[PDB]
């Protein structure tokens, strides 16, 4: 069965830069029957390029489509913040085989992230635990710490985090950090902070609540 | 206006079965083939086989010809997958899409999760995350819901029943230790708006049948 060898699997690049993506066929492969798709976080592969050459409807000029020998290859000519996907070959002999996808990533300057405070509710006290969500919102790069204190009590191993793909508008990141303690434990102590230290922000920036307003 | 649309995902135990349906709409049904892909968590995109609706007959890729078969019904426009056998690297996203010209998919559904493990549905908690800003403070204040404890993925998160989508991130779901998934979707507003605008977080887990509507509101 033919494979398709897709490289890289992985790249980064700057807005305006040119980016190829190459797709190598094991054996023969017909122009007509090698495809090209996007598929953007969360949604179905959309397609992009059909028959090795041509757009398909509703895609942008920069995207073109060629091929060398059994090396197909997929061109942005001008990177896109909206052209953040894993692309796809995929070659048609009967049976169909794609390739296994090129993640591309967007580079872009330093954004501080917003950091907003959230407290359990009292709904989800009532059952027996707490919850408290730390939010960071809308910065680059993604490396972040986010360090939870309460009463300047540094936890450690009771936090966990959770973080989104870059934005197909501006390319930044969120993060939310969950810290979840018994309601015993919640009730034992007054002021809850998360601290952030990223490179957006020249002193580490910190959240905090008194429980009991 | 041509659209496909894959339901029958849930959580299977281990050698059981399950039949993925998938409805298209807005073409003459018999025109096209129709083709399952399916996709596992962070790996690449897998063709199954597909059917000829005008004439009955299925291609398989020779890795599934044993354990799935493909049916289709005319009368109800409508595609199926049944699968057999079903273990822990089946678990994936499935697609159905249409083949069009050439041997291209130009239309994909939005694909169904199909979870083989041997644990037990549950459905999520939803609680409000209020906002950051009172109505008569300045700038924006962000709001959210968090989903807790449920198993298996996913779950679907529209703010005011999709009306509200610009300033939305409904994070990955993190796998706690006790086995059960949960995240937190957030939404930025100005915050003179939470005098005006009612917010409500719509978290629908279809694995359980779990519907549940939170409203937001400022706390104390």
């Known amino acids: 069965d033919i494979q398709m060898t897709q490289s890289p699997s992985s790249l980064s690049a700057s807005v305006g830069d040119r980016v190829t993506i190459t797709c190598r066929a094991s054996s023969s492969v017909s122009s007509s029957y090698l495809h090209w798709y996007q598929q953007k976080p969360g949604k179905a592969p959309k397609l992009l390029i059909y028959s090795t050459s041509n757009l398909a409807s509703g895609v942008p000029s920069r995207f073109s489509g060629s091929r060398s020998g059994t090396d197909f290859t997929l061109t942005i000519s001008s990177l896109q913040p909206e052209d953040f996907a894993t692309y796809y070959c995929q070659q048609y002999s009967g049976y169909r085989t794609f390739g296994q996808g090129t993640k591309v990533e967007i580079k872009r300057t330093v954004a501080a992230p917003s950091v907003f405070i959230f407290p359990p509710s009292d709904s989800q006290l009532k059952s027996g635990t707490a919850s408290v969500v730390c939010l960071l919102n809308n910065f680059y790069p993604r490396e972040a710490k986010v360090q939870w204190k309460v009463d300047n009590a540094l936890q450690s191993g009771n936090s966990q985090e959770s973080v989104t793909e870059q934005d197909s508008k501006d390319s930044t990141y969120s993060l939310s950090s969950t810290l979840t303690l018994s309601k015993a434990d919640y009730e034992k102590h007054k002021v809850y902070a998360c601290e952030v230290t990223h490179q957006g922000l020249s002193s580490p920036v910190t959240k905090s609540f008194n429980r009991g307003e | ?220």
């Open chain 2, 1 to 220: 206006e041509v659209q496909l649309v894959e339901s029958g995902g849930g959580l299977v135990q281990p050698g059981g079965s399950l039949r993925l349906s998938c409805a298209a709409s807005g073409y003459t049904f018999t025109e096209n083939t129709v083709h399952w892909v399916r996709q596992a968590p962070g790996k690449g995109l897998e063709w199954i086989g597909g059917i000829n609706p005008y004439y009955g007959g299925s291609i398989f890729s020779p890795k599934f010809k044993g354990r799935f078969t493909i049916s289709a019904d005319t009368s109800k426009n409508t595609a199926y997958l049944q699968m057999n056998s079903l273990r822990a690297e089946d678990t994936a996203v499935y697609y159905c899409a249409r083949r069009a010209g050439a041997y291209y998919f130009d239309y994909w559904g939005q694909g169904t999760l199909v979870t083989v493990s041997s644990a037990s549905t549950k459905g999520p908690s939803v609680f409000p995350l209020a906002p950051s800003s009172k109505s008569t403070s300045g700038g924006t204040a962000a709001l959210g819901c968090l989903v807790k404890d449920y198993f298996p993925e996913p779950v679907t998160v529209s703010w005011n029943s999709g009306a509200l989508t610009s300033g939305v991130h409904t994070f990955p779901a993190v796998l706690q230790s006790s086995g059960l998934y949960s995240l937190s979707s957030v939404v930025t507003v100005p915050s003179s708006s939470l005098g005006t605008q009612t917010y409500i977080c719509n978290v629908n887990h279809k694995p359980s049948n779990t519907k549940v509507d939170k409203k937001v509101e400022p706390k104390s």
